[PDB]
Design a protein around this ligand. Structure first.
Ligand SMILES: [Cl-]
Ligand SMILES: [Cl-]
Ligand SMILES: [Cl-]
Ligand SMILES: [Cl-]
Length: 108
């Protein structure tokens, strides 16, 4: 169910759903703050992000995958800013999991 499940999790601002797709180690870069997080910390960071930025919409404009990696790029509109989101996936145990999330506020 990748990347549909991740896209849905962002659309709903739901870190618990996102969790299901997180790798055991995730690099987060959120407003230029970088963290190399275990899964539990990554979910916690995303929970805080969604709590502080109530999601209105998430729309993807480019996605793709090869045998061992993939990506999703889109725009997240929230009640506290709009953000470009990049999710980069790696294949682990035959499943695509998130290895990096970048979130960067738009210039508006
Ligand atoms: Cl950590
Ligand atoms: Cl935050
Ligand atoms: Cl979409
Ligand atoms: Cl959409």
């Amino acid at each position: 169910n990748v990347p549909e499940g991740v896209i849905g999790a962002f659309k709903e601002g739901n870190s618990q759903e996102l969790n299901k797709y997180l790798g055991d180690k995730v690099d987060l870069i959120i407003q230029n703050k970088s963290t190399h997080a275990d899964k539990r910390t990554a979910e916690g960071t995303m929970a805080a992000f969604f709590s502080n930025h109530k999601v209105g919409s998430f729309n993807v404009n480019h996605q793709g995958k090869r045998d061992e990696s993939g990506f999703v790029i889109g725009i997240l509109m929230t009640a506290n800013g709009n953000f470009r989101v990049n999710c980069f996936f790696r294949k682990v145990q035959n499943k695509y999991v998130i290895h990096q999330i970048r979130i960067d506020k738009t210039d508006e």
